[PDB]
Amino acid sequence: MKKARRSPSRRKGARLWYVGGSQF
Amino acid sequence: MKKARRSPSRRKGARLWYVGGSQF
Amino acid sequence: REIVDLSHLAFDCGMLGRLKTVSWTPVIAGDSFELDAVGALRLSPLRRGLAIDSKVDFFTFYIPHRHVYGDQWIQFMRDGVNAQPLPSVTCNRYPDHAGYVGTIVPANNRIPKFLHQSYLNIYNNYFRAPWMPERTEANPSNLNEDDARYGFRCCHLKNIWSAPLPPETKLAEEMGIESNSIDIMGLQAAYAQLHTEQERTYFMQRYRDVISSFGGSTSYDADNRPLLVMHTDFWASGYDVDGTDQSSLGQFSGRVQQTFKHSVPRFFVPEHGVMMTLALIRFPPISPLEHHYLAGKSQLTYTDLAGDPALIGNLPPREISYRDLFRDGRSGIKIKVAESIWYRTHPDYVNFKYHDLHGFPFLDDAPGTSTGDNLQEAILVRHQDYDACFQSQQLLQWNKQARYNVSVYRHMPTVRDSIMTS
Amino acid sequence: REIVDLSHLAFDCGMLGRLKTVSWTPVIAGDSFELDAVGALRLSPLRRGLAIDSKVDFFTFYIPHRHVYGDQWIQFMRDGVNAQPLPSVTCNRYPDHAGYVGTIVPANNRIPKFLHQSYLNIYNNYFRAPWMPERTEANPSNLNEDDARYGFRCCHLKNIWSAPLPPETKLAEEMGIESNSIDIMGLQAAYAQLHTEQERTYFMQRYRDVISSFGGSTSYDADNRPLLVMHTDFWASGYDVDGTDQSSLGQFSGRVQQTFKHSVPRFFVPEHGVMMTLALIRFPPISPLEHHYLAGKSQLTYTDLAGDPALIGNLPPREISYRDLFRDGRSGIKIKVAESIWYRTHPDYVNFKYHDLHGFPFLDDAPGTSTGDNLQEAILVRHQDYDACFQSQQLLQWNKQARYNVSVYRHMPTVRDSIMTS
């Protein structure tokens, strides 16, 4: 019940979001 | 083409023909 | 053949006896699907302290879209980019009325058939009593309020009164005979024939099981059964909260909170379809009203008490009624049990005193007491039977939250490749 | 789980291009079936000496009765000893009109559906060109004289004129465009879409093959395809018989006589059904009338001769007609071949002199010469094309005899047990 509180990172795999540049 | 001339023996397996006794 | 990260969180909740979908993922032919879920499951606040732990079951099935759309799917895939789009099924115009298949009813009030049909197939192939009517609603909109929002009802845990031999079990097999003689050879066949009939009724009602009977096998495509990929089960325990003010001092409230893992080992997806994962929370049917069968018999006979083997193996099933098992048992509910079964298992006991204390998840009323002289209705868990013991179902009766870590290898051009033309 | 000996002999014979059943065995769920066949195959007496050897193919498929009888079967097995008997299909009132499924038409003029339907399924799933009309006769009695007695016709061995790209192959793909501009992004998609269309037409016309395309798989139950258990192929050679009397001295007659083994490794039968084994004898389509494609072109262009790669990989298919391949070629038969394919394979050659000597199994007339401007009819082997070279079809065109040694492990009470009551 540690991870269950925090929405995953989806760090595995390639890049999905192209939005024009770096966005925090 | 040796076996192909002679109808198999059906020797494998159990007994199939009961006819009252021994019949050649 | 690269990685797609489908991990995600899920906050859910439902009614007791009902089977709810907690997460579904669409997959594609060729995919390698792995899922490791972890989280915690809870129950709404209890009126009193903790009494018994509920048993939780998690399932994960794989269902080929072909199983849903039929030949129509085959054509779809065949015709490729020329295929007539697959049809959607309808839901009632309410947000929650899609809950059973784990989704909010979308803006257009219709959801993909594969969600609905799969849920059905799952239910009909594993959850209902084999003898109960096959569930066949055509659209989520044909479902009733409760079902659509909380899922279908499932069978109570198995016990003498909830696992009777199928209601149509033969109690005698007649054999015609000429006015003065009987063909003993026929009688022999008669028995044999009966045997095939029984075996079938008792445990081979499904085609697949009959074929297994012969020592053969069947693919899951043979009868269109959803493929069970992983089944987990665990008890839901927690703790009590002590009351500390002038009037609450010496009082307790049960907070059930159980952590759990449900992990599906890397699975190969042969064809497009869905990976559905559902949960089912139940309470063993304890009741201050149930008594030992023998305590209820009025005329105890040798056949009942003796436990003479010679008899126990050659008598026919016995028809008895719920009245014979619960004090307020309904006499109209008849069940066919196996002789001297009461000597093969003992029932749980609850002093009649708890009978009316709110806060205990016991069945304070003989099963089927408010559904009428109908067996199926007694066997299927009636979630209302529990409303009594919860402080407030702001989140229905149970609820949970977990992280679903999903990794799927598949042929998938990078987003860069999709958005770039040349 | 004891042994049942199903070994047996089989004397058979048939027409050239047609696919005939040579032995079928009913099996039961749970059976372990092994088959080792051995015998010799011959051709009717030839008019002249031996010229070319015919190529023989033997197949053995397994077909679940469920594939034939459908849900009706499932019920059958389910209802057990209460099942409504399976229906039989009808044959024409003639002894031989069941030949395609390897059996004499029984006294009642009807044979079990599983024989007929399987033969069909086998043909439609492996023998016909994927683009040809699916064979769908309902009863053996709907079959025509030749088919019913000798089996369906199959495709000639593959060559440039008998393996053309499916007749509906795209030769150009149009893309709409606004009066003065073209969406280059759309054009890109247009190609992609086309690609899916082509791949499909060229080699993914069957559902199963499309799914394989994705790197997935399908059970044989998915599209109801008969399961191929063993495929054998061999050439049929023999010897010449020397003529020795005053006028026959210096003459020869070809007697083709080939021995062969066809062995199926122990196979597990998951459900009741049939194990059918069929044969197919064919002659490579040599013809004194066919010539190299390039020899026939009137205006030889760079694109034809050069064999410039840059061109060969980016041009569309080429439409040509049999007239472009045989001197008496039918101009009405159009085929779509791949550019510069004539540079990827060479054709057999027969001096026009053999063109009218009876006794050679050559196609002495351009394929399709007597079937009309119809491609399918040219591709499928016309057995009459060979009548010319046989001294006399007292035993049709070919014929054979072999011993089929079959051993099957299965649950089977001894005959003693069956006939004894107590």
Swiss-Prot record, chains A, B:
Keyword Endoplasmic reticulum: no
Function, in words: Mediates ssDNA packaging into virion, it locates to the internal surface of the capsid, thereby displacing the internal scaffolding protein B during virion formation. Protein J binds to and is packaged with the viral ssDNA. Additionally, protein J plays a role in viral attachment efficiency to the host cell.
GO annotation, cellular component aspect: host cell cytoplasm; viral capsid
Family the entry assigns: Belongs to the microviridae J protein family.
Primary location group: virion
Name of the protein described by the UniProt record: DNA-binding protein J
Alphabetized GO MF terms: DNA binding
Entries under InterPro entries matching the protein: Microvir_J-like (IPR006815)
Subcellular localization, as worded in the UniProt entry: Virion; Host cytoplasm
Sorted UniProt keywords: Capsid protein, DNA-binding, Host cytoplasm, Viral genome packaging, Viral release from host cell, Virion
Subunit organization: Interacts with F protein.
Swiss-Prot record, chains C, D:
SUPFAM superfamilies, A to Z: ssDNA viruses
GO biological process terms held by the UniProt record: symbiont entry into host cell
Record keywords: Capsid protein, T=1 icosahedral capsid protein, Viral genome ejection through host cell envelope, Viral penetration into host cytoplasm, Virion, Virus entry into host cell
Pfam families cross-referenced by the UniProt entry: Phage_F
Subcellular location(s) of the protein: Virion
Protein's UniProt name: Capsid protein F
Primary localisation category: virion
Natural source organism: Escherichia phage alpha3 (Bacteriophage alpha-3)
Quaternary data: Pentamerizes and interacts with H protein, G and B pentamers to form 12S pre-assembly complex. By binding with protein D, induces joining of twelve 12S complex to form the procapsid. The procapsid has an external scaffold made of 240 copies of protein D, 60 copies of the internally located B protein, and contains 60 copies of each of the viral structural proteins F and G. Upon genome packaging, interacts with protein J. The mature virion is composed of 60 copies each of the F, G, and J proteins, and 12 copies of the H protein.
GO molecular function, one term: structural molecule activity
Superkingdom to which the source organism belongs: Viruses
Entry function: Assembles to form an icosahedral capsid with a T=1 symmetry, about 30 nm in diameter, and consisting of 60 capsid proteins F. Upon virus binding to host cell, one of the spikes dissociates from the capsid and the virus interacts with LPS through the exposed EF loops on the F proteins. After the genome had been ejected, the channel formed by the F proteins at the unique fivefold axis remains open.
Similarity annotation: Belongs to the microviridae F protein family.
Gene Ontology CC entries for this record: T=1 icosahedral viral capsid
